[PDB]
Coordinates of C-alpha atoms in Angstrom, one line a residue:
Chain P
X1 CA 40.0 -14.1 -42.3
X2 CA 36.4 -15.3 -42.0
X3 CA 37.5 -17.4 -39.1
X4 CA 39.6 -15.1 -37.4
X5 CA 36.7 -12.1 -37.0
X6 CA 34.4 -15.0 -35.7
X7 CA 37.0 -16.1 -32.8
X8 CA 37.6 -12.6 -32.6
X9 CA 33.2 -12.2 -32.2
X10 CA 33.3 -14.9 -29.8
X11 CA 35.5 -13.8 -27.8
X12 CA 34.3 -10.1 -27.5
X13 CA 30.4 -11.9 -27.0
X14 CA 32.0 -14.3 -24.5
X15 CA 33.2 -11.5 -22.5
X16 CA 29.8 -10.2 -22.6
X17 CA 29.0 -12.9 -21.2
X18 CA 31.4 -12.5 -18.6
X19 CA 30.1 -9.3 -17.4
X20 CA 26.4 -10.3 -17.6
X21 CA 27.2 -13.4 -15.3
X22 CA 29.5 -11.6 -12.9
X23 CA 26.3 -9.0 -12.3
X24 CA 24.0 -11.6 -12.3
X25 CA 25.7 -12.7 -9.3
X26 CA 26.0 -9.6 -7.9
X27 CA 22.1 -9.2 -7.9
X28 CA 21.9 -12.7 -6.4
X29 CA 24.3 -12.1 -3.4
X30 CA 22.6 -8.5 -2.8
X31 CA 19.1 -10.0 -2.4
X32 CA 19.8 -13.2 -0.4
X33 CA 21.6 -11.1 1.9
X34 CA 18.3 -8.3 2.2
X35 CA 16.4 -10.8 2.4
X36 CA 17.7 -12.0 5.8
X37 CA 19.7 -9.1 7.5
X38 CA 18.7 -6.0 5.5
X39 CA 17.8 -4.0 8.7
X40 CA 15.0 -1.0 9.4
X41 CA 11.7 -0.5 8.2
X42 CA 10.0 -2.7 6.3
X43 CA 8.8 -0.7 3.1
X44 CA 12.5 -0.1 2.6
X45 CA 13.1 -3.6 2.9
X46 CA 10.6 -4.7 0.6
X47 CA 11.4 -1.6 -2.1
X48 CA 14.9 -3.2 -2.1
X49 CA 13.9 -6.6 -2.8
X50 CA 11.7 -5.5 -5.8
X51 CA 14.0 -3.7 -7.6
X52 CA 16.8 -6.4 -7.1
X53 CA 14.7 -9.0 -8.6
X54 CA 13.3 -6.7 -11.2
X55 CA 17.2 -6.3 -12.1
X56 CA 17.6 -10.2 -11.8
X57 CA 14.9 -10.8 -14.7
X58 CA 16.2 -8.2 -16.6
X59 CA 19.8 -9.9 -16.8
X60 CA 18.7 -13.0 -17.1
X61 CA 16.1 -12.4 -20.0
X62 CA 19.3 -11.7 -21.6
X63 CA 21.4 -14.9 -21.1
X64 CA 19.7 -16.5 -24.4
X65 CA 20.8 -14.6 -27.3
X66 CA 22.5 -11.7 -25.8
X67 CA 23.5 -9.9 -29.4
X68 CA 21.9 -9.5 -32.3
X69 CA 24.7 -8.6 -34.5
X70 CA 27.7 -5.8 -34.9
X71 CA 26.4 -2.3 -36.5
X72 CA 29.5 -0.7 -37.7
X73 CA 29.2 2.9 -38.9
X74 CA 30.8 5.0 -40.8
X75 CA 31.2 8.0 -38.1
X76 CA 33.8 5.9 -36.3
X77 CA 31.7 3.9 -33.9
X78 CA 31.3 0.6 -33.1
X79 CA 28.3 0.0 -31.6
X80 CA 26.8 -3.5 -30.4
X81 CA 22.9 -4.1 -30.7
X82 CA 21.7 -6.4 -28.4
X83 CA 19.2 -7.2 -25.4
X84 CA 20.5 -4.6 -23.0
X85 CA 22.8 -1.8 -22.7
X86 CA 26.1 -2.9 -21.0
X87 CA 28.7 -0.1 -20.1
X88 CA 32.0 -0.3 -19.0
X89 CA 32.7 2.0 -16.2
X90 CA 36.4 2.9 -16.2
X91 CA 36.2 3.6 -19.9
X92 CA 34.0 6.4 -19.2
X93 CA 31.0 4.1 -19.1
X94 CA 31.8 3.3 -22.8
X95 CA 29.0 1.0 -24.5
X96 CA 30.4 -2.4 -24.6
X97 CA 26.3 -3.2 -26.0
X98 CA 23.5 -0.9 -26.6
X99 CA 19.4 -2.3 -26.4
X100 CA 17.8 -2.3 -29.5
X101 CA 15.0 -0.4 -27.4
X102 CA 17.1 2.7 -27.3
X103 CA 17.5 5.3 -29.8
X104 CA 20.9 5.1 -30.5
X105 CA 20.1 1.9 -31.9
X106 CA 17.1 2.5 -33.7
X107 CA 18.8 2.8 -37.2
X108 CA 19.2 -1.2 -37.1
X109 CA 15.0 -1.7 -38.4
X110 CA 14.8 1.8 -39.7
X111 CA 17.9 1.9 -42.0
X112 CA 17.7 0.6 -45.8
X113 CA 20.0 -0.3 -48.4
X114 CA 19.5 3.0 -50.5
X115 CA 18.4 4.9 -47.1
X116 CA 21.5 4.3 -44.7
X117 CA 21.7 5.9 -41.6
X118 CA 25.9 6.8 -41.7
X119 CA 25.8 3.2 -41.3
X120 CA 28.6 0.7 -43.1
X121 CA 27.6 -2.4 -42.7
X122 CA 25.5 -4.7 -40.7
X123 CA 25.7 -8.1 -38.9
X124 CA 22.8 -10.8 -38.0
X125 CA 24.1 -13.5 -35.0
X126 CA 22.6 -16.8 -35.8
X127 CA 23.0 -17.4 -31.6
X128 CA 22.5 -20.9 -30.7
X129 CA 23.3 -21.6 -26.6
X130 CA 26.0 -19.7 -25.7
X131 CA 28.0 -19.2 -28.7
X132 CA 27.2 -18.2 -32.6
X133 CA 26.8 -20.8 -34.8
X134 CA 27.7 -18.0 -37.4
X135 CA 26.9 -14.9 -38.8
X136 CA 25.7 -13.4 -42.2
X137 CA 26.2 -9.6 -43.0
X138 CA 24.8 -6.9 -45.1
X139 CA 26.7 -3.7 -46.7
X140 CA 24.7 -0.6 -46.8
X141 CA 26.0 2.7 -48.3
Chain Z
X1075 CA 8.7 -37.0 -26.5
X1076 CA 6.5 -34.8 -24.2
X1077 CA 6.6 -31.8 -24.6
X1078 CA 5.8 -27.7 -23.0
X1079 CA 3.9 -25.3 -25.5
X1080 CA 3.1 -22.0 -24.0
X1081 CA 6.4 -21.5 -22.3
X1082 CA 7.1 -17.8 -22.4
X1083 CA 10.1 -15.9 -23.4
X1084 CA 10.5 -14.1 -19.5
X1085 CA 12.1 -17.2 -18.1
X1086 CA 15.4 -19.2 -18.1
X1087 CA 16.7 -22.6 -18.3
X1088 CA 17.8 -25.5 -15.8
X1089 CA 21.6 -25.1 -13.7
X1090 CA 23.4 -28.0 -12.5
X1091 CA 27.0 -27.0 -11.7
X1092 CA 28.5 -30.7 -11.2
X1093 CA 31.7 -30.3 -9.4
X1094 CA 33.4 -31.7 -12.6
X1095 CA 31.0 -31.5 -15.3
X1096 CA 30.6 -27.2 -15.1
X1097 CA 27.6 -27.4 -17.1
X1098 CA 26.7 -24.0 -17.1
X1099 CA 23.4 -23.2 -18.4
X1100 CA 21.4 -26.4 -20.0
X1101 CA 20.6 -25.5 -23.6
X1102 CA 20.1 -28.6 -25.7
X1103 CA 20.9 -32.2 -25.9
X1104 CA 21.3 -31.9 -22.1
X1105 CA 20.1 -34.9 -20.0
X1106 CA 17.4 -34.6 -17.3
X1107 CA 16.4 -37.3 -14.7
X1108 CA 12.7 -37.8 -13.7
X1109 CA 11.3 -34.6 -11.5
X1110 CA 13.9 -32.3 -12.5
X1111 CA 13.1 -29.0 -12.7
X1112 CA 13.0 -27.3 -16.3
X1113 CA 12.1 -24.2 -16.2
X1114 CA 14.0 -22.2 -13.5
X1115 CA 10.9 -20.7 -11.1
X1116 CA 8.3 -21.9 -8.6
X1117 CA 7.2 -25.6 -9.2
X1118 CA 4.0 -26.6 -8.7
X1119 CA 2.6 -28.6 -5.7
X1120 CA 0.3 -31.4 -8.3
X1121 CA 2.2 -31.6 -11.3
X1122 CA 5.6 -32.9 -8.2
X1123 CA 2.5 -35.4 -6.6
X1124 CA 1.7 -36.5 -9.7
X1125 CA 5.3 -37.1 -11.0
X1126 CA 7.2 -37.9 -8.3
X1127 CA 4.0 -39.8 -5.5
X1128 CA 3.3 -38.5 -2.2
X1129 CA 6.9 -39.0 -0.3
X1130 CA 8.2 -36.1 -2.5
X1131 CA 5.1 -33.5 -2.3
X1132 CA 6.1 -33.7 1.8
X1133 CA 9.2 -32.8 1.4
X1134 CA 9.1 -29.9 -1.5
X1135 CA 6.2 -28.7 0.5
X1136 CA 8.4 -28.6 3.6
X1137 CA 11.2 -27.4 2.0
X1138 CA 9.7 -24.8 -0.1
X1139 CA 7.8 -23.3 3.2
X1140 CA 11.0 -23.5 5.2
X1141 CA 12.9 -21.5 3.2
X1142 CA 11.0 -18.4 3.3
X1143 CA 11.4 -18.2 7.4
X1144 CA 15.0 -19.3 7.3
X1145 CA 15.8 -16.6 4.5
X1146 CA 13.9 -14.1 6.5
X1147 CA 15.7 -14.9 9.7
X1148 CA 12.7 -16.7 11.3
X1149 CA 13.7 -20.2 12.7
X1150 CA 10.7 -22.8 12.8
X1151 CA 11.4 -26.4 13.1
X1152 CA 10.3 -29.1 10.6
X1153 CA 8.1 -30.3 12.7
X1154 CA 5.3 -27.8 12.9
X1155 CA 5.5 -27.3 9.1
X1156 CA 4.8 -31.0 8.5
X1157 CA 2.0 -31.1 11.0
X1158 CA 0.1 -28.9 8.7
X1159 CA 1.4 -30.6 5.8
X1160 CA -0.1 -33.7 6.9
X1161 CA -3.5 -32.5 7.2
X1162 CA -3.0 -31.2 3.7
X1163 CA -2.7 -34.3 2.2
X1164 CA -5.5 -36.7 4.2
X1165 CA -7.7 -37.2 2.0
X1166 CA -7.5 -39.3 -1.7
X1167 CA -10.2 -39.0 -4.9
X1168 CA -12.3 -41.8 -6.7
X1169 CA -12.4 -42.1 -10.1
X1170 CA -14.9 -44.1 -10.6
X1171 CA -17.4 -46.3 -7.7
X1172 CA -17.5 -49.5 -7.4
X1173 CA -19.6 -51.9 -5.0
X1174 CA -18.5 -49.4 -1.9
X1175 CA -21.6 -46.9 -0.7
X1176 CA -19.5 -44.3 -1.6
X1177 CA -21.2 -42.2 -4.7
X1178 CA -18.5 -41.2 -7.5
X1179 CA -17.1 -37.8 -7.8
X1180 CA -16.2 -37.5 -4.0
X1181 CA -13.5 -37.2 -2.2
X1182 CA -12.3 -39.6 1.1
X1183 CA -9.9 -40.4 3.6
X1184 CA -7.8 -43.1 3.5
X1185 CA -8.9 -44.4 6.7
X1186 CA -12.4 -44.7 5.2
X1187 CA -11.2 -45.7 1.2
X1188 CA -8.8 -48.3 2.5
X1189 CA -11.4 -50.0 5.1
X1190 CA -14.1 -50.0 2.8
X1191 CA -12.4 -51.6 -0.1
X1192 CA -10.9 -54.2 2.1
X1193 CA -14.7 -54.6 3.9
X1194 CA -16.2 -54.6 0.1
X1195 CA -14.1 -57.3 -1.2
X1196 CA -15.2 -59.8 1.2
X1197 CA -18.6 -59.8 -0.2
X1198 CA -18.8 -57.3 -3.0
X1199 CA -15.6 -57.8 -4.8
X1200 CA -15.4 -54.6 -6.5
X1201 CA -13.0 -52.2 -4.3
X1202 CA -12.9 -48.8 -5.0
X1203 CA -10.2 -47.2 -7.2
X1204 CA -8.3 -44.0 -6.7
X1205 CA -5.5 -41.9 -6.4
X1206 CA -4.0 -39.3 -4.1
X1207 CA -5.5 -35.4 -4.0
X1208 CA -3.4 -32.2 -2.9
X1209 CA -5.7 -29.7 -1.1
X1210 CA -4.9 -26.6 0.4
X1211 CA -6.1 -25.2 3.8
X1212 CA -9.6 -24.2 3.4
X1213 CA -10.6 -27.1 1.4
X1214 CA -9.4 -29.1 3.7
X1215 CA -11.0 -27.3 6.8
X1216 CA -14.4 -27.1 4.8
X1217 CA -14.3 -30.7 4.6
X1218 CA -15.1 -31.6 8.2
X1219 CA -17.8 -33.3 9.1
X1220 CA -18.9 -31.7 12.1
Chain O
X977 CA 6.6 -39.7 15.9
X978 CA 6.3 -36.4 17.0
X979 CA 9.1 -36.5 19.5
X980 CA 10.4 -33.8 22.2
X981 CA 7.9 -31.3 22.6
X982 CA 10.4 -28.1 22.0
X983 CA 9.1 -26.2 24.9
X984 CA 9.8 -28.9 27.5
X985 CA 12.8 -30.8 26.0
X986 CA 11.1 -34.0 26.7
X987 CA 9.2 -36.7 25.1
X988 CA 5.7 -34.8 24.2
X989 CA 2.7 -36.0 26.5
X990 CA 0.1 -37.8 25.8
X991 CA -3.0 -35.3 25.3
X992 CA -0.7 -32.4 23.4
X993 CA -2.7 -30.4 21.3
X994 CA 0.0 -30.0 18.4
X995 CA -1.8 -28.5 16.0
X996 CA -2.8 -25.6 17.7
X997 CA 1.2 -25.4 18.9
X998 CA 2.1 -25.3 15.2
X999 CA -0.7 -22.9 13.8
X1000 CA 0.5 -20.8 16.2
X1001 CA 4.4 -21.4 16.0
X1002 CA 3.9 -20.8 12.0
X1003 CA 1.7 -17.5 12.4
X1004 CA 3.4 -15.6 15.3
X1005 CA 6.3 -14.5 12.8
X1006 CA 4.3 -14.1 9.8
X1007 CA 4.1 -9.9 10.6
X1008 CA 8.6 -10.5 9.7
X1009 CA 7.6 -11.5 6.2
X1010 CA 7.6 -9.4 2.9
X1011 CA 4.6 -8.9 0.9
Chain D
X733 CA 31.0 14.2 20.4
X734 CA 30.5 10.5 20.1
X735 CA 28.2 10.3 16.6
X736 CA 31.9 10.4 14.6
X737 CA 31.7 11.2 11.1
X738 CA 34.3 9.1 8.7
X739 CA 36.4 11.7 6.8
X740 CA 36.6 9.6 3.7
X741 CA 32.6 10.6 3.0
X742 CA 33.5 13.8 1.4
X743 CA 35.8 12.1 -1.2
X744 CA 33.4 9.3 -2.1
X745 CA 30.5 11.4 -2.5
X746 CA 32.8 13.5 -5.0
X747 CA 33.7 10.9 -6.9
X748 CA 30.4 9.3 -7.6
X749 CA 29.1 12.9 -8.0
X750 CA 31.6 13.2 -11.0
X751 CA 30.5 9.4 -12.1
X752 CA 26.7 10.6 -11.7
X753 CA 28.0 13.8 -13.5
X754 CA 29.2 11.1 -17.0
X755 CA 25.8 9.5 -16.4
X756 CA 24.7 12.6 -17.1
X757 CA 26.6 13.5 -20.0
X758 CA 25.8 10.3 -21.7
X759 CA 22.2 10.0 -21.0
X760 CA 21.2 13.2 -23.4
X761 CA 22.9 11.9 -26.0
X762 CA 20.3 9.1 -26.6
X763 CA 22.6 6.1 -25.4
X764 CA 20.3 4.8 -22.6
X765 CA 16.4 5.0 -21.7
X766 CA 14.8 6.5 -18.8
X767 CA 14.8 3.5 -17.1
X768 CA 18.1 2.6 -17.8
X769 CA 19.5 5.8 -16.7
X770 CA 17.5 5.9 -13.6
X771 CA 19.1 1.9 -12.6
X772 CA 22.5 3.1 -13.6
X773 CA 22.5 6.0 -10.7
X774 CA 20.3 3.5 -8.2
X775 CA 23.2 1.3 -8.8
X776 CA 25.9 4.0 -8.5
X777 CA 24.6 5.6 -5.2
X778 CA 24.1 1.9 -4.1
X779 CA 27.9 1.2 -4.2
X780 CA 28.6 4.7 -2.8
X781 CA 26.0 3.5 0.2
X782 CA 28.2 0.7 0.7
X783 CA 31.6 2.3 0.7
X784 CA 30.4 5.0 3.3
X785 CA 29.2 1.8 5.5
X786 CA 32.7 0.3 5.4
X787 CA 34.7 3.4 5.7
X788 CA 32.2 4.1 9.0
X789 CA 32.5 0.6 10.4
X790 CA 36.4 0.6 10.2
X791 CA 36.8 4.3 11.3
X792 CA 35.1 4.4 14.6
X793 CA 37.1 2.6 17.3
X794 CA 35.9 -0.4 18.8
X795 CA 35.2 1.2 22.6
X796 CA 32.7 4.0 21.3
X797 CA 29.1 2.9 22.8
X798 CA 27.2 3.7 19.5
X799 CA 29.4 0.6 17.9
X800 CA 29.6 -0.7 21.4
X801 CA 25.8 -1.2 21.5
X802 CA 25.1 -3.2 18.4
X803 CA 28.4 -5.3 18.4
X804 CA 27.4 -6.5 21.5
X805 CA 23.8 -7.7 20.1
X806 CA 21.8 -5.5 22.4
X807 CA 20.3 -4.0 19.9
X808 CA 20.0 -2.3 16.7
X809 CA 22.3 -2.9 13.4
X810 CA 24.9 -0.9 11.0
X811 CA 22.4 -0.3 8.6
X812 CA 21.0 2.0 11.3
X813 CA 24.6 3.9 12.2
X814 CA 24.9 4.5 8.8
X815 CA 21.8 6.5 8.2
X816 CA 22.4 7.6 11.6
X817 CA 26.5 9.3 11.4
X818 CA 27.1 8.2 7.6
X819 CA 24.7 8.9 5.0
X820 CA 20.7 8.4 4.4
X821 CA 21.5 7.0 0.9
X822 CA 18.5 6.2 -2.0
X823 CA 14.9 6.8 -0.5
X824 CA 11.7 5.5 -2.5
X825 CA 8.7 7.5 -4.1
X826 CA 5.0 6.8 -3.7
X827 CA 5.1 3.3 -6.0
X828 CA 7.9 1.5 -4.8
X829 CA 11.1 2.8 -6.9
X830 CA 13.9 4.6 -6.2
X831 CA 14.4 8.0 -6.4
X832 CA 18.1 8.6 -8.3
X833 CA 18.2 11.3 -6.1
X834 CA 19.9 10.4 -3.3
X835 CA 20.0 11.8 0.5
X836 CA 23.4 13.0 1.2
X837 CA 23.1 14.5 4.3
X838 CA 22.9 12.1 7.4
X839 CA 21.0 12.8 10.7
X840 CA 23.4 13.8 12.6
X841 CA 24.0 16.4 10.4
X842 CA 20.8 17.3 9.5
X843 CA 18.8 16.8 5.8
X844 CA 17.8 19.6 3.5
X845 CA 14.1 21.0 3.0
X846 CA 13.5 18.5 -0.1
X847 CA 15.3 15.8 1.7
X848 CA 13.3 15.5 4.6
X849 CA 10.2 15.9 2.3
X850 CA 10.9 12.9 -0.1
X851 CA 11.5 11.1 3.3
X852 CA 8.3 11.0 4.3
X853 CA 7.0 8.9 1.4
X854 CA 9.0 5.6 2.9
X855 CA 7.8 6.8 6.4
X856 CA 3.9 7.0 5.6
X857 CA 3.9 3.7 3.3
X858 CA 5.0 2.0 6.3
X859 CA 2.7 3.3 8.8
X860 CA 0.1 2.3 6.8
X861 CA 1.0 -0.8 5.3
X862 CA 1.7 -2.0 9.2
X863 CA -2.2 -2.5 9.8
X864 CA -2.4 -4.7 6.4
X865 CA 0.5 -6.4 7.7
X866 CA -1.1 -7.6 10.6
X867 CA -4.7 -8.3 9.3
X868 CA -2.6 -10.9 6.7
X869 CA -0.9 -12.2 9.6
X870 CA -4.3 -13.0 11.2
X871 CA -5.3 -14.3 8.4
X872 CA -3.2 -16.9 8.0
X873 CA -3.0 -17.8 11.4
X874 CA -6.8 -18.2 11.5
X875 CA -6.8 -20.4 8.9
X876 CA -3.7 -22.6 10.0
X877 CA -5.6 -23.3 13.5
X878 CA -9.0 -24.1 11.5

């Protein structure tokens, strides 16, 4: 039970992973290449080069503890909180992992055990590398 | 066990990639040799001289120049980037004077460090300690003597 | 040491003025660069 | 007649009009920031950008003289046909970012009133960053030869 929803957490995170890697590299390819043969004038050059390595740190702030924790509710979602907001794209961009930055996912610090925000119950990663060690969780209702 | 306080939370952590190892990203109990980098960003010029001696400071400094022109499609050979680097690094710092004319606190060429110590201990037996100094351009062109 | 002078594909001369050659060599595509 | 335009534009502008379109659904909602949501259509007319390219570069045969002039390395680049028969793609405001407004319309074609006018912004930073340029260059080069 208990071990079977944390391979199940580890693999979902690891995917995250996945997907965080995969754009990292994305970013990396796009700005060597601009950097050498991006072609035309230079502000446009330059403007391209900024806002690739501004999306470089902003991935790779992430890599170190990527989630937080689950925040299930009790309208039917299942929402990640984490570092940034990942959606997947054929789903209808559906939130794979929403920023604790946004609103959406400002129930997470505002939320109380006799003030719940429709919330069921919520989840704290202990993350350690690229894995969590384990997790503790809170019900709320 | 030396360690690196005010590192901020903005950065990331060492890659290797052995070709059988698949390291990944180094979080902890990883194994670092000496002059390895830590802290993926832009090293700095001293801290490599001071770790690593002289030979090494040539070559990041050529290296980290180089790649800037070669990314940017500008093709410069070695050559001409060493020349400069040479004249960056002429010059080495006393720590303290000996017998040697030379007052403390100063900074000399090896041409001049090196003859004077080995004219000093002839006679004076004291030659003059010190190590190599890093400059950048216009310390270095301030310093002529004309 | 120095080798070839580039511009001549020989062994440099004696009398070159180098540094000059490579102040200039490293500046003239500095205007390429991002800043 | 020989500034071709690649048929498959009108498709791919379509469909990441209907993706800018669920962008736009989900932003209101309170699921991404500002920021976020501008990135997420950067990054969306980016890819957009890109298809057009390669649907331009395969579509116009290999004899034309506008392909005929940069394959041969006279001059120019595809980054350059693209704007030119393809599409502008993302233009920049005053401080440096993108505007998640893209330019649809190429030159050959002709851009709109509000087009043209966020245009100029790239344009004017150019023109007058090119005299900073070149101080910096002199700069340096002054320095290197000291």
């Amino acid at each position: 039970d208990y071990e079977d929803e944390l391979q199940s957490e580890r693999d979902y995170v690891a995917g995250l992973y996945a997907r965080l890697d995969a754009e990292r590299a994305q970013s990396q390819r796009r700005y060597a290449a601009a950097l050498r043969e991006h072609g035309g004038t230079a502000v446009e050059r330059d403007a391209e080069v900024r806002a690739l390595a501004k999306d470089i740190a902003r991935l790779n702030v992430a890599d170190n503890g990527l989630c937080f924790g689950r925040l299930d509710t009790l309208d039917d979602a299942r929402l990640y909180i984490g570092r940034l907001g990942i959606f997947d794209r054929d789903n209808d961009f559906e939130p794979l992992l929403l920023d604790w930055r946004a609103p959406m996912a400002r129930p997470f610090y505002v939320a109380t055990a006799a003030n719940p925000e429709n919330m069921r119950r919520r989840r704290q990663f202990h993350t350690l590398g690229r894995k969590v060690v384990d997790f503790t969780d809170e019900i709320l209702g | 066990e030396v360690v690196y306080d005010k590192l901020s939370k903005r950065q990331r952590l060492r890659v290797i990639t052995h070709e059988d190892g698949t390291e990944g990203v180094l979080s902890d109990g990883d194994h670092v040799e000496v002059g390895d980098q830590l802290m993926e960003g832009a090293a700095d010029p001293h801290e490599v001289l001071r770790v690593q001696g002289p030979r090494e400071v040539q070559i990041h400094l050529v290296k980290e120049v180089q790649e800037v022109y070669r990314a940017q499609g500008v093709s410069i050979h070695d050559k001409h980037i060493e020349v400069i680097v040479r004249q960056m690094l002429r010059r080495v710092t006393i720590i303290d004077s000996g017998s040697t004319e030379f007052l403390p606190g100063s900074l000399t060429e090896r041409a001049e460090f090196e003859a004077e110590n080995r004219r000093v201990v002839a006679e004076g037996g004291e030659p003059a300690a010190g190590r190599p100094v890093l400059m950048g351009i216009t310390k270095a062109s301030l310093a002529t003597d004309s | 040491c120095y080798g070839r002078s580039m511009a001549t594909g020989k062994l440099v001369d004696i009398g070159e003025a180098v540094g000059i050659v490579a102040a200039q060599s490293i500046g003239e595509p500095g205007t390429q660069l991002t800043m | 007649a020989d500034v071709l335009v690649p048929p498959q534009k009108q498709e791919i502008l379509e469909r990441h009009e209907a993706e800018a379109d669920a962008i736009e659904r989900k932003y209101q909602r309170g699921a991404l920031n500002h920021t976020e949501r501008n990135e997420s259509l950067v990054k969306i007319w980016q890819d957009a950008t890109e298809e057009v390219g390669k649907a331009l570069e395969e579509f116009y045969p290999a004899d034309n003289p506008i392909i005929t002039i940069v394959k041969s390395g006279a001059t120019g680049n595809l980054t350059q046909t693209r704007t030119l028969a393809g599409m502008k793609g993302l233009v920049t405001n005053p401080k440096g970012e993108f505007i998640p407004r893209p330019i649809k319309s190429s030159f050959r074609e002709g851009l709109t009133v509000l087009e043209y006018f966020i245009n100029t912004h790239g344009a004017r930073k150019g023109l007058a960053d090119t005299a900073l340029r070149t101080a910096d260059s002199g700069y340096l080069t002054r320095r290197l030869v000291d």
